[PDB]
Amino acid sequence: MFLQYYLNEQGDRVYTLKKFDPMGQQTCSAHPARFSPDDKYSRHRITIKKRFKVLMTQQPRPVL
Amino acid sequence: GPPERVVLLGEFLHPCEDDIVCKCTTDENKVPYFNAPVYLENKEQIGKVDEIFGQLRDFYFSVKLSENMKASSFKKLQKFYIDPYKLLPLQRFLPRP
Amino acid sequence: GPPERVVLLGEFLHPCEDDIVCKCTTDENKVPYFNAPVYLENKEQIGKVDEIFGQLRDFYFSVKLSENMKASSFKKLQKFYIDPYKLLPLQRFLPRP
Amino acid sequence: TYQELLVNQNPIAQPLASRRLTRKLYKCIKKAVKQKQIRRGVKEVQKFVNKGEKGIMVLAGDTLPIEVYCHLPVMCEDRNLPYVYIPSKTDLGAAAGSKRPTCVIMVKPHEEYQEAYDECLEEVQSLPLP
Amino acid sequence: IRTGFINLDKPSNPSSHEVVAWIRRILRVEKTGHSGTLDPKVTGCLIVCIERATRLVKSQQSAGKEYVGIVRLHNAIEGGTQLSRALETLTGALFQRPPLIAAVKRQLRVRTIYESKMIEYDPERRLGIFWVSCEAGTYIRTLCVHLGLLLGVGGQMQELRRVRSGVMSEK
Amino acid sequence: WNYSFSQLPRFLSGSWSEFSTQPENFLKGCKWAPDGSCILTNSADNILRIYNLPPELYHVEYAEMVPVLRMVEGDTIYDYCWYSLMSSAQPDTSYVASSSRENPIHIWDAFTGELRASFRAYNHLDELTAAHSLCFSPDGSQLFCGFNRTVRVFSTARPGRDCEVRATFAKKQGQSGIISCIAFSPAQPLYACGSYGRSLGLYAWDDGSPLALLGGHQGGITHLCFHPDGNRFFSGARKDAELLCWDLRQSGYPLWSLGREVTTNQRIYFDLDPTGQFLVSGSTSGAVSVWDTDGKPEPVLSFLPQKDCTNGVSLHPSLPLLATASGQRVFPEPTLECRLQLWWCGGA
């Protein structure tokens, strides 16, 4: 849809309409991916998120 | 709920079979709505206008009293008050020009 | 029909998509009823109150105009009037003590 | 110009095609679109990988969020289908004769561009895997 | 899990009651609550309380929200500063008519907008990003209509996302 | 003066320079005012432009045409039209309706170019929906406008959200899809709706009750024209080679089919004479074709305004003037300018 964003230097979302940020990188869509409850590709997403070290379990653990 | 203000409707005459007959004394001879709430000057509802009768410029009205009220309570020439929006002008009942 | 009297509701600001936006200037900061008829001081109905918006003590209202009216007709700071019974007190919308 | 698009790549966009291989893949897509032998959406590509239709699956390496298409790499590895990433989604759409972008295309084989298809297929399978 | 909650990023198709239904199928639990409705096409922060955490839902539902939305204006304005001033006007305790439901006309009510900000404006498409911090139960669709009336050009809420639900945010 | 396509139309001034401001701009049709005073043009920049009739016609070289008005919209313009009963003698009649993406139906004053009124169509959720088509009634009292599965009828006198809603699809029965064009019969008390769902529908004016439902076309219908007889009418579609001729008598099946190259998802216009004898149509190739309607319509002429798509064609109601709008969407590749033009079609 219309809302895009890019991250500033302290990790906050900076919302914008424009497809490119002030440093020339592409802006992400603000909205998450569309979900289906009948999705059967859980194995597949874990498989390659593990491979490229971007699964949520492999990130730095949050400070609570 | 309780209205912002109330205007003089009329004064108490004799009771009649557990409701109260009252002489109407409105400014400009205005006529109340049927089932219009009747208040005392403290803005407490005593009843509702049941009957309207008599001559056009000298008319009476009976008041069907509230659940908690009794017809013996009221004194002679005690005034009653009405929400000014459920009055109507006398011209409405007078004939068309 | 036409009401017995009308009280100052508000003044004309800019039009907006064939209805008219108006700054509310009532005595005691009273708030109009939704779909309350809006009159000019001649007691002629121009429209009805559609939207009410803005801060509590400085609010606006749009007027959905009548069949025969046009939004171009009205001048800046032209006053509009309402039947005083379809106003409400501000205290109603303020929080309970 | 190519190196500027390399900033926008995903975490999961490997193996990325070489600059010349990217050019070969676009030219193969143009010929396949003319012959009416491609599939464009995730919706489509997912449907025909399930049916078991063979083809080179070209992915856009700047797709975000990755959840929209990150199941497809493993769907290919289950069926031994050859897949490859390319720098941008806009160019992948532009290769298919479209102004709007797309994140994935599957090129089917055909007689009219069989030699170009086999040239692309050979280099895709030869890529180093992460 | 029975004493827990999820800080969910709600997707853009389903209703908020459908989303928490899907969560209670997946996790295989009997009860869930959801920190205030997001409308079917709205995304963002939705605190989903599970089981014994549903005892906290009133505190979560009553908490202050934040939104990032897009207003689409129906005619051109002078510039981004004019939209920025209309947002400053609609700060503080505002009148808002609650929408009709089952032909039950709810009365005009008051809701506070704590802060407003005009983030970006596009004169070509007549689109404006706004950020709003507000009380629970504020109608942002209604805010965009009023913002359009106040400018004189007219307007509608194109898009919406909730970036904060009380204690939890998208950060 | 009278129309004659025994000879190729002579060139008369057009405008190219202002359309070349934006990259990959293109015209989206052209329409004469019903009195013949001026011509209205849509473009991919979302700017309606009005050009006056050339003074040098009545006064040889002609200068490049300049528009007397530019009236900017903020989004894709789906449809636009002159008021049905326009005359340049009356400021109250000279105005232009215009619908745009996620916007109200705007009414623009044709002299000053100010926003004069707004008609607003809301769905059941109270969200604004934009009209994909526009048509004034032959009296000029009502403004018909097409949406997904429904026509709305605003009263021209009362601008606003107030409208009579007319559903064309009820419990999976009737005319489905976005209603892309409306047109009224000059003689009969009816109107015809074309849809992007393949079908045509006829409807009675007063009630909106279906008179007929017609197939024929192999793509989404984009335009309609009634013949001045009242019986006969014509239709055209996107990505569809045939321009279908119909008749209100002997209904249910199209009488004839006229060939034209349409290879894009475009509203390629076509128009009749005021007298009703000739029929002119554009093409994605560029070639403007002409048929004599007075049996099957006979091909009279084919000529090329430019080496590009001729999307718009408009015939002047009094004079023998053909207007032509050009341009189309260019498709990219991994790493001629569009124009309005006038043409004299009078006899020797």
Side-chain angles (χ1 to χ4, degrees):
Chain A
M1 313 195 290
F2 289 106
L3 262 185
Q4 308 292 119
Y5 80 94
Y6 62 92
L7 300 183
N8 68 353
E9 69 177 15
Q10 60 258 44
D12 302 322
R13 287 195 175 188
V14 185
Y15 287 94
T16 182
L17 297 170
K18 294 184 293 189
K19 259 58 186 177
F20 301 94
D21 73 340
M23 298 170 284
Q25 302 179 236
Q26 289 178 18
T27 56
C28 312
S29 178
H31 315 91
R34 185 190 66 73
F35 181 77
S36 165
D38 307 319
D39 186 283
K40 296 170 195 294
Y41 302 110
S42 298
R43 184 172 65 70
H44 302 249
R45 292 198 288 279
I46 291 157
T47 297
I48 65 157
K49 285 179 179 176
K50 274 190 181 173
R51 191 179 296 169
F52 291 104
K53 309 288 188 171
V54 288
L55 193 63
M56 191 139 67
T57 59
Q58 296 166 308
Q59 308 313 293
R61 202 184 294 263
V63 176
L64 290 172
Chain B
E4 69 190 316
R5 67 187 188 288
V6 295
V7 168
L8 181 65
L9 177 63
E11 63 191 348
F12 178 82
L13 298 180
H14 60 268
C16 186
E17 304 186 303
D18 306 287
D19 65 9
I20 61 170
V21 177
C22 308
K23 186 72 196 296
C24 205
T25 61
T26 51
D27 193 14
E28 316 166 51
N29 191 342
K30 290 198 179 173
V31 181
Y33 268 84
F34 172 51
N35 300 312
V38 179
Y39 300 90
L40 198 51
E41 70 269 35
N42 311 132
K43 306 184 187 178
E44 279 184 309
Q45 193 184 137
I46 69 165
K48 292 183 174 62
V49 177
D50 182 41
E51 282 284 353
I52 298 156
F53 62 96
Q55 295 174 338
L56 259 56
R57 293 156 191 281
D58 287 302
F59 72 97
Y60 307 81
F61 66 98
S62 76
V63 183
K64 181 169 182 178
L65 299 175
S66 293
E67 173 51 37
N68 64 331
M69 294 289 170
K70 199 172 186 179
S72 302
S73 304
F74 304 98
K75 280 184 163 284
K76 200 179 178 183
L77 314 179
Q78 180 169 351
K79 301 187 187 297
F80 306 112
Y81 298 84
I82 191 167
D83 177 49
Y85 173 75
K86 302 294 183 181
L87 285 170
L88 304 99
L90 184 55
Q91 195 74 355
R92 193 172 191 283
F93 304 103
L94 289 165
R96 294 189 174 184
Chain C
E4 69 190 316
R5 67 187 188 288
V6 295
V7 168
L8 181 65
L9 177 63
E11 63 191 348
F12 178 82
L13 299 180
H14 60 268
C16 186
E17 304 186 303
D18 306 287
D19 65 9
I20 61 170
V21 177
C22 308
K23 186 72 196 297
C24 205
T25 61
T26 51
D27 193 14
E28 316 166 51
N29 191 342
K30 290 198 179 173
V31 181
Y33 268 84
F34 172 51
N35 300 312
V38 179
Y39 300 90
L40 198 51
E41 70 269 35
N42 311 132
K43 306 184 187 178
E44 279 184 309
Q45 193 184 137
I46 69 165
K48 292 183 174 62
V49 177
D50 182 41
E51 282 284 353
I52 298 156
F53 62 96
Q55 295 174 338
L56 259 56
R57 293 156 191 281
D58 286 302
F59 72 97
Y60 306 81
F61 66 98
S62 76
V63 184
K64 181 169 182 178
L65 299 175
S66 293
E67 173 51 37
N68 64 331
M69 294 289 170
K70 199 172 186 179
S72 302
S73 304
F74 304 98
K75 280 184 163 284
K76 200 179 178 183
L77 315 179
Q78 180 169 351
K79 301 187 187 297
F80 306 112
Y81 298 84
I82 191 167
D83 177 49
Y85 173 75
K86 303 294 183 181
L87 285 170
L88 304 99
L90 184 55
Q91 195 74 355
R92 193 172 191 283
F93 304 103
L94 289 165
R96 294 189 174 184
Chain D
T1 61
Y2 182 94
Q3 210 279 316
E4 293 188 309
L5 295 175
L6 202 67
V7 173
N8 298 316
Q9 302 301 293
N10 293 348
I12 68 161
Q14 296 182 38
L16 186 59
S18 305
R19 185 167 170 289
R20 75 185 299 264
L21 179 54
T22 299
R23 214 175 195 82
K24 290 182 190 298
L25 288 163
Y26 292 149
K27 288 187 286 184
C28 190
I29 292 155
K30 288 175 190 183
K31 293 165 186 181
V33 164
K34 184 169 178 180
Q35 210 66 33
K36 196 174 174 185
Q37 289 289 299
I38 67 149
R39 299 283 71 189
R40 296 170 173 255
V42 165
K43 184 184 171 166
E44 285 196 325
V45 167
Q46 181 184 296
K47 190 181 178 174
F48 297 93
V49 170
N50 275 296
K51 289 192 185 290
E53 303 201 325
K54 304 302 184 289
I56 311 167
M57 199 186 73
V58 186
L59 293 155
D62 65 340
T63 310
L64 293 166
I66 68 170
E67 282 79 51
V68 300
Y69 83 156
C70 64
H71 64 284
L72 291 174
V74 177
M75 286 187 82
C76 295
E77 289 167 20
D78 293 4
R79 299 161 185 74
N80 308 308
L81 300 178
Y83 75 95
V84 65
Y85 288 99
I86 52 160
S88 62
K89 62 188 159 183
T90 53
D91 293 2
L92 182 48
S98 177
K99 297 196 75 69
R100 290 166 266 257
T102 187
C103 76
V104 63
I105 285 178
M106 192 164 76
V107 184
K108 304 191 193 190
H110 199 270
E111 293 151 301
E112 290 291 348
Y113 55 90
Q114 192 71 240
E115 293 180 8
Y117 179 94
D118 292 326
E119 191 175 351
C120 295
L121 176 56
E122 182 184 311
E123 196 172 346
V124 165
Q125 292 185 323
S126 300
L127 286 163
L129 199 70
Chain E
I1 291 171
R2 302 300 175 287
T3 59
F5 76 99
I6 298 160
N7 182 10
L8 193 73
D9 191 10
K10 189 195 159 285
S12 74
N13 283 127
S15 59
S16 64
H17 54 67
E18 277 188 62
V19 167
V20 301
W22 295 344
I23 292 161
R24 70 169 176 277
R25 307 283 183 292
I26 290 159
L27 300 180
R28 301 190 293 279
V29 292
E30 298 181 309
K31 267 191 186 170
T32 47
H34 72 66
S35 183
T37 51
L38 296 168
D39 301 315
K41 286 165 186 170
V42 181
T43 66
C45 182
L46 187 74
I47 293 163
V48 183
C49 304
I50 302 157
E51 299 315 296
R52 283 208 292 288
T54 62
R55 293 171 190 178
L56 281 53
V57 295
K58 188 151 194 288
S59 65
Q60 307 318 126
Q61 285 207 344
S62 302
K65 305 305 199 299
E66 297 177 13
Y67 288 96
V68 173
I70 298 168
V71 59
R72 161 165 260 144
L73 303 173
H74 298 154
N75 208 0
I77 59 172
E78 290 181 37
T81 55
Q82 196 175 319
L83 179 59
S84 189
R85 289 164 190 182
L87 281 160
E88 284 184 343
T89 305
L90 302 177
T91 307
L94 305 187
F95 293 113
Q96 293 199 330
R97 206 202 312 103
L100 185 72
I101 48 171
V104 183
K105 296 264 180 175
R106 287 178 287 171
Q107 297 140 42
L108 188 76
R109 75 187 190 188
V110 179
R111 290 293 182 282
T112 311
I113 290 173
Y114 301 112
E115 304 185 55
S116 286
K117 194 173 291 186
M118 200 285 303
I119 286 172
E120 190 169 298
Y121 181 71
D122 182 49
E124 287 87 325
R125 297 173 171 287
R126 302 160 185 173
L127 293 174
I129 304 176
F130 60 87
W131 168 92
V132 161
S133 181
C134 60
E135 186 168 27
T138 311
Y139 299 102
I140 307 297
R141 273 183 63 193
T142 298
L143 181 68
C144 295
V145 168
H146 295 169
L147 192 61
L149 290 166
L150 193 57
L151 290 162
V153 296
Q156 279 283 307
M157 192 192 77
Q158 183 61 33
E159 205 159 299
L160 192 62
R161 177 173 172 77
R162 193 198 280 158
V163 304
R164 188 170 209 96
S165 292
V167 57
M168 307 306 296
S169 70
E170 72 185 355
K171 212 300 194 176
Chain F
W1 291 316
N2 198 355
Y3 278 96
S4 184
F5 299 96
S6 301
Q7 318 85 344
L8 272 63
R10 299 169 48 258
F11 178 73
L12 189 147
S13 48
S15 54
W16 45 87
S17 300
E18 78 179 300
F19 297 115
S20 73
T21 51
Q22 298 201 155
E24 203 202 322
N25 199 356
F26 57 87
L27 283 70
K28 298 184 80 194
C30 60
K31 305 193 180 187
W32 291 108
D35 68 334
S37 181
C38 48
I39 188 161
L40 174 58
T41 62
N42 187 7
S43 165
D45 61 2
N46 310 330
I47 300 174
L48 294 175
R49 299 179 171 80
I50 299 163
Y51 297 86
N52 283 4
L53 185 70
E56 292 293 313
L57 178 55
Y58 296 124
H59 192 268
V60 179
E61 189 178 358
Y62 292 66
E64 190 178 8
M65 300 202 305
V66 176
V68 301
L69 286 173
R70 297 188 182 74
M71 46 214 193
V72 179
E73 292 277 26
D75 223 343
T76 288
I77 303 173
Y78 299 161
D79 202 0
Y80 62 103
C81 59
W82 292 104
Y83 178 54
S84 180
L85 266 66
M86 163 170 167
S87 299
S88 293
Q90 300 168 235
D92 294 6
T93 66
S94 299
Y95 59 85
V96 167
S98 176
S99 192
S100 177
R101 176 182 172 176
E102 297 192 73
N103 281 283
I105 300 166
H106 291 143
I107 304 300
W108 301 93
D109 191 284
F111 286 109
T112 191
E114 76 187 317
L115 182 56
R116 182 160 149 182
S118 298
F119 299 93
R120 289 174 287 120
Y122 295 87
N123 66 357
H124 62 92
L125 303 176
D126 207 60
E127 300 185 316
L128 186 75
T129 56
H132 279 73
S133 52
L134 299 170
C135 187
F136 288 97
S137 54
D139 291 5
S141 59
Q142 295 170 301
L143 175 53
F144 284 61
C145 45
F147 305 79
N148 185 39
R149 306 176 170 186
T150 184
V151 176
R152 296 183 161 92
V153 184
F154 293 88
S155 187
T156 308
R158 194 208 292 190
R161 21 181 326 152
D162 311 352
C163 58
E164 180 181 315
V165 182
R166 300 188 177 185
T168 60
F169 200 63
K171 304 205 180 295
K172 66 169 188 179
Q173 192 276 325
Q175 186 173 21
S176 185
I178 293 165
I179 289 170
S180 58
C181 47
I182 310 97
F184 284 76
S185 189
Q188 288 276 311
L190 65 86
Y191 62 100
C193 292
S195 173
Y196 289 147
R198 271 66 181 182
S199 187
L200 281 181
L202 300 177
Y203 301 86
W205 180 7
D206 61 336
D207 295 339
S209 55
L211 296 166
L213 191 69
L214 307 168
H217 267 100
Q218 308 295 301
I221 296 179
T222 53
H223 193 73
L224 281 160
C225 272
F226 276 88
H227 197 280
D229 295 8
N231 301 334
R232 177 158 52 197
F233 62 94
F234 308 89
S235 52
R238 73 194 174 179
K239 287 199 169 180
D240 197 318
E242 54 258 42
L243 185 77
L244 293 180
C245 312
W246 304 85
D247 188 2
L248 194 68
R249 317 158 303 168
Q250 199 182 0
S251 63
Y253 187 92
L255 298 187
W256 311 108
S257 305
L258 277 43
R260 56 165 202 169
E261 185 167 318
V262 187
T263 59
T264 51
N265 296 313
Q266 271 185 283
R267 185 191 304 277
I268 306 299
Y269 287 88
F270 59 90
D271 196 6
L272 292 158
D273 280 0
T275 59
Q277 70 171 114
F278 297 128
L279 168 57
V280 181
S281 178
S283 179
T284 302
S285 58
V288 176
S289 298
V290 186
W291 301 272
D292 182 24
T293 61
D294 176 38
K296 186 167 182 175
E298 186 170 48
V300 172
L301 176 66
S302 303
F303 87 99
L304 188 68
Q306 68 287 301
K307 292 188 170 66
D308 208 335
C309 168
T310 300
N311 57 75
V313 298
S314 200
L315 296 173
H316 195 291
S318 59
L319 302 173
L321 278 175
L322 171 62
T324 64
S326 70
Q328 67 184 306
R329 185 171 291 164
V330 178
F331 292 98
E333 295 292 345
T335 310
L336 303 182
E337 293 175 13
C338 57
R339 59 195 67 222
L340 179 67
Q341 298 185 123
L342 276 60
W343 304 85
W344 183 259
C345 310

